[PDB]
């Protein structure tokens with residue numbers, strides 16, 4: 001339409017005039033702010049057989065001060081795009097402005113709490129607020145479009161523009177047209193795709209003003225209750241998606257822009273381990289092949305890698321981890337069985353062009369399989385091949401089921417197995433059986449076992465098939481050649497020739513068989529062996545794979561290995577592999593180029609042998625080095641009191657006055673004389689402090705206060721030095737009403753009420769018109785008994801400077817309003833010479849907030865990817881306390897002793913300096929009159945990985961420097 005690089009028809013996208021199935025994974029650059037590790041993820045995604053990544057940009061992190069766009073350093077999108085290009089991964093850009101994403105504000109900066117207009121509407125005050133952000137981020141995206149030689153192929157305007165309320169005329173075509181035009185005016189010419197939250201046809205082609213180019217929708221059919229990870233409720237597997245597609249957008253490729261790849265988890269939830277169990281390998285093979293049954297041509301998994309809600313970037317209901325239960329874990333490992341299962345499907349799609357040109361039919365409980373206990377969805381092609389997606393009719397069934405197939409083929413209709421036996425579907429599994437499947441001119445008439453990959457090499461063709469344990473399978477090939485078993489036993493392998501075919505039966509075994517039919521070799525694997533195979537693209541013109549184009553797909557090799565194979569290239573007489581290892585690994589290479597005489601693994605020449613069938617073999621030894629981690633309790637811990645506000649000498653004369661008589665918040669008008677909403681004064685993040693001055697009559701008895709921080713927030717209150725009490729917090733409370741008893745006061749004396757409030761983040765704004773992102777933080781009501789409300793004059797602070805935030809490197813959300821944070825003491829090399837020697841393990845003996853500093857050295861070996869974790873102990877029921885840990889100035893843990901569940905906090909290399917000095921700053925807030933302390937504080941590691949990753953450069957880590965704007 002505006003360019004010829006990315007086009008489409010009813011069946012699929014075309015990239016440079018060639019059909020491609022887009023298999024994508026969601027990855028948010030702001031949740032892993034280390035550019036070398038961004039390349040790591042992209043390479044792990046490419047190794048799944050995927051060709052695409054989808055990303056959000058978080059407006060709240062890049063325009064913290066209105067009118068100042070800052071996507072630099074750790075927030076630079078450009079190295080992220082270069083990493084995607086280097087890995088050979090196309091991009092779906094989703095800059096918002098609204099993203100939801102379990103992020104603070106759903107992407108919106110807290111200054112949108114002062115916008116006189118409905119958020120996500122055609123109100124001029126909202127639209128004007130978005131212009132600076134979109135014109136920047138969309139210009140940066142424009143520069144990296146595929147039209148300019150970059151990786152970006154699709155653009156999403158808005159996010160799930162689906163639900164409206166409260167006087168908005170939803171859907172507003174003027175609003176969506178405006179959002180689309182902002183992107184176009186910045187230079188975006190690639191297609192626009194939306195992501196309707198349900199299949200509701202919103203903004204579909206043909207709806208006129210506000211219509212996108214390709215209609216997309218989302219689906220989370222298993223929901224977000226990770227507490228019952230084995231429960232698959234009846235009727236939750238979608239069945240009508242293709243029907244809906246043909247009613248809502250028949251002229252565009254069927255697209256699911258967010259399909260479930262995991263789940264979020266709230267404060268106090270079951271943990272992301274439970275989420276990984278619910279959305280495990282069984283979920284993937286059943287639910288993802290089900291999406292294939294609808295002829296999905298654009299499929300994006302939310303999330304593929306989740307990362308970390310570091311520096312308060314997350315929404316209030318979520319905690320620091322955003323592991324998501326996804327295929328790549330928070331610490332970047334690919335140990336989960338769901339990664340390996342996903343790789344099998346991803347590699348199937350990469351090499352099966354007939355999948356896109358076939359004609360999908362409706363699901364059937366008879367006609368294809370000989371029992372109604374199975375359902376079969378046919379995708380019928382003629383010369384280009386057919387596909388048959390098999391599953392249990394009751395999709396949750398764990399039963400083992402025997403069956404036979406009746407499949408049409410170019411050689412006639414056939415009942416399978418022809419040579420005896422039955423097929424088996426064991427429990428929560430699904431299969432894509434194929435007919436007339438093209439392997440570079442050799443026709444596979446049928447195969448019951450599933451295709452992992454195939455390639456044409458100079459010496460012949462190779463096909464890799466797999467089945468689960470206990471399965472009997474069968475295939476037939478259009479040929480007059482006979483079959484020979486060239487590796488493994490002939491036991492269990494049966495065969496027969498007809499006048500123009502050969503038929504082969506086999507039982508799945510843990511030992512590989514290789515059969516040969518003419519110039520076709522066929523690997524017959526069990527699923528668990530297939531998990532260990534990889535299909536890197538073979539570069540001959542450099543070291544980089546390139547994108548998944550037809551030539552570069554065709555020119556790939558097959559590698560059996562272990563943990564990971566990243567890349568492969570041919571240079572002279574050398575075949576080079578880059579790979580990672582977590583155990584001693586037997587490496588095999590199938591389809592070695594005829595010119596190669598030497599094998600290199602991670603730059604090192606490696607002995608190989610060649611077997612009778614031309615397969616190269618080598619061993620890579622794994623010998624983990626000594627990982628020597630310092631004992632965090634034995635460090636030279638220095639303490640400073642980070643609540644000096646409750647000392648009677650404290651002078652708050654430089655604090656901002658909370659003296660606005662009118663709020664600028666349209667959602668909730670004031671119920672106090674002046675606004676005590678933090679965002680009215682530009683404070684949107686971290687701990688908030690309020691100070692209320694009054695002169696006592698002497699007859700004051702109680703002080704009531706409604707505080708609001710979001711779900712699981714807490715607050716504590718003091719009258720001068722006297723602790724009044726705390727709200728210790730519950731996930732179920734986003735606000736709380738407390739009445740505290742005052743001590744006897746002296747008539748005529750001045751007192752100051754100090755209130756500390758945990759801002760858990762700003763709410764999302766999922767429903768258009770509800771304006772829930774405007775939900776204020778701070779003090780909603782107060783009453784000093786027998787005194788008018790105007791008797792208290794309030795001061796407040798959050799992060800120093802508010803929207804004129806101090807730390808341009810670490811961004812606008814990283815630090816809150818504690819004294820120690822305002823002073824910059826959380827950064828490397830604080831002025832702690834003359835501070836007291838005390839540890840968070842000793843802690844506090846009364847209510848309050850302590851600040852702790854220590855350094856430690858790491859000297860971990862080069863060439864190893866070693867995941868490190870901060871651990872906070874909770875082996876027995878604790879007193880209520882709250883902790884933040886800053887690592888070299890970056891907040892990478894937020895902890896609530898009484899709510900949880902996170903005790904283990906991954907911190908990536910780059911934030912940590914693996915061969916240098918590191919700084920921990922810990923805040924301990926005891927919401928208890930007896931005080932509190934840490935049970936234990938420990939640095940740990942998991943399996944070291946012998947890695948191909950280059951050196952991880954440390955991100956910028958500005959050291960402590962005195963701040964003139966501070967209140968001292």
Ligand SMILES: *[C@@H]1O[C@H](CO)[C@@H](O[C@@H]2O[C@H](CO)[C@@H](O[C@@H]3O[C@H](CO[C@H]4O[C@H](CO)[C@@H](O)[C@H](O[C@H]5O[C@H](CO)[C@@H](O)[C@H](O)[C@@H]5O)[C@@H]4O)[C@@H](O)[C@H](O[C@H]4O[C@H](CO)[C@@H](O)[C@H](O)[C@@H]4O[C@H]4O[C@H](CO)[C@@H](O)[C@H](O)[C@@H]4O[C@H]4O[C@H](CO)[C@@H](O)[C@H](O)[C@@H]4O)[C@@H]3O)[C@H](O)[C@H]2NC(C)=O)[C@H](O)[C@H]1NC(C)=O
Pocket residue numbers: 276277278280281282334335336337340468528531532562563564582583943
């Ligand atoms: C180096 O990197 C390697 C990757 O390259 C990495 O290797 C991977 O390691 C992970 C573990 O970290 C492996 O995943 C696990 O695999 C377990 C072993 O079973 C696998 O292998 C068997 C053959 O050797 C197969 O027979 C088996 O298939 C069968 O079971 C499948 C899943 O249940 C099923 O889909 C198949 O159809 C078939 O029936 C399988 O492939 C596996 O048992 C384990 O399963 C569970 O764990 C998951 C959560 O992590 C859940 O998603 C899943 O539902 C299972 O949960 C159960 O077990 C948990 C304990 O681990 C409990 O927490 C759960 O509550 C639940 O427990 C119930 O059921 C249990 C069995 O009855 C029992 O414990 C209880 O009684 C309870 O009722 C998991 O998927 C992965 O396969 C490896 N990948 C490769 C490629 O090898 C290696 O670890 C790395 N090394 C180092 C040192 O870091």
Ligand SMILES: *[C@@H]1O[C@H](CO)[C@@H](O[C@@H]2O[C@H](CO)[C@@H](O[C@@H]3O[C@H](CO)[C@@H](O)[C@H](O[C@H]4O[C@H](CO)[C@@H](O)[C@H](O)[C@@H]4O[C@H]4O[C@H](CO)[C@@H](O)[C@H](O)[C@@H]4O[C@H]4O[C@H](CO)[C@@H](O)[C@H](O)[C@@H]4O)[C@@H]3O)[C@H](O)[C@H]2NC(C)=O)[C@H](O)[C@H]1NC(C)=O
Pocket residue numbers: 266267268269270730731732874876877878896897898899900901902903
């Ligand atoms: C250190 O160790 C200690 C000791 O082991 C740990 O302390 C324990 O921490 C538990 C987890 O925080 C805590 O359990 C909680 O207790 C409260 C009540 O006091 C309860 O509300 C919690 O259950 C809900 O919330 C969680 C999410 O936080 C959900 O996963 C769960 O399904 C429940 O959800 C319901 O309420 C939510 C909000 O109200 C809703 O969003 C949700 O949809 C659902 O609502 C429906 O049901 C409600 C009734 O259940 C009802 O309001 C309505 O009908 C709704 O439809 C959870 O049980 C333990 O109390 C605590 N134990 C002790 C001995 O202190 C500590 O966490 C550990 N720390 C770390 C760091 O690991």
Ligand SMILES: *[C@@H]1O[C@H](CO)[C@@H](O[C@@H]2O[C@H](CO)[C@@H](O[C@@H]3O[C@H](CO)[C@@H](O)[C@H](O[C@H]4O[C@H](CO)[C@@H](O)[C@H](O)[C@@H]4O[C@H]4O[C@H](CO)[C@@H](O)[C@H](O)[C@@H]4O)[C@@H]3O)[C@H](O)[C@H]2NC(C)=O)[C@H](O)[C@H]1NC(C)=O
Pocket residue numbers: 271272273323329330331332333335867869871872873903904906936938940941942943
């Ligand atoms: C792949 O990535 C995922 C996500 O990043 C990794 O999964 C996380 O792994 C960590 C580390 O194993 C895990 O945290 C542990 O959970 C255990 C509960 O299931 C806890 O028992 C354990 O705490 C103990 O060990 C710590 C040291 O590691 C101590 O500091 C801590 O105080 C606890 O130690 C006490 O208890 C143990 C035994 O109970 C005893 O031996 C000690 O002496 C002491 O008394 C950790 O909290 C997370 O739960 C995992 N997160 C998720 C979401 O799954 C996974 O490990 C990565 N895999 C690889 C191979 O890298």
Ligand SMILES: OC[C@H]1O[C@@H](O[C@@H]2[C@@H](O)[C@@H](O)O[C@H](CO)[C@H]2O)[C@H](O)[C@@H](O)[C@H]1O
Pocket residue numbers: 099100101102159160197218219220258263264766
């Ligand atoms: O990680 C969750 C994911 O949710 C997506 O949105 C919503 C979900 O929150 C719910 O309210 O409705 C539908 C179905 O569950 C779902 O699309 C959202 O687009 C993402 O940004 C995430 O928040």
Ligand SMILES: *[C@@H]1O[C@H](CO)[C@@H](O)[C@H](O)[C@H]1NC(C)=O
Pocket residue numbers: 383384438439440441
């Ligand atoms: C099979 O692949 C070959 C080689 O790429 C191609 O020339 C041929 O047209 C394909 N056949 C069918 C029926 O799609």
Ligand SMILES: *[C@@H]1O[C@H](CO)[C@@H](O)[C@H](O)[C@H]1NC(C)=O
Pocket residue numbers: 482483484495
């Ligand atoms: C085909 O191969 C099978 C197994 O090796 C064998 O039984 C059969 O005799 C062969 N057929 C011919 C015609 O050689």
Ligand SMILES: *[C@@H]1O[C@H](CO)[C@@H](O)[C@H](O)[C@H]1NC(C)=O
Pocket residue numbers: 645647648649650651720749750751752
């Ligand atoms: C209470 O503390 C303030 C400063 O926070 C101080 O100026 C005032 O004198 C104190 N009042 C009493 C009665 O000690």
Ligand SMILES: *[C@@H]1O[C@H](CO)[C@@H](O)[C@H](O)[C@H]1NC(C)=O
Pocket residue numbers: 116663664665666
């Ligand atoms: C928003 O603007 C209207 C119209 O000018 C005005 O009446 C109202 O007071 C404003 N509200 C806020 C909260 O600023």
Ligand SMILES: *[C@@H]1O[C@H](CO)[C@@H](O)[C@H](O)[C@H]1NC(C)=O
Pocket residue numbers: 699786
């Ligand atoms: C002091 O407060 C008490 C309790 O509210 C009230 O009964 C009494 O009248 C008050 N005394 C004075 C002197 O104002």
Ligand SMILES: *[C@@H]1O[C@H](CO)[C@@H](O)[C@H](O)[C@H]1NC(C)=O
Pocket residue numbers: 706733735736737781
């Ligand atoms: C606190 O009181 C206010 C005003 O009376 C009320 O709106 C709110 O629901 C109360 N909050 C809780 C958590 O009870």
Ligand SMILES: [Cl-]
Pocket residue numbers: 819822823966967968
């Ligand atoms: Cl200060």
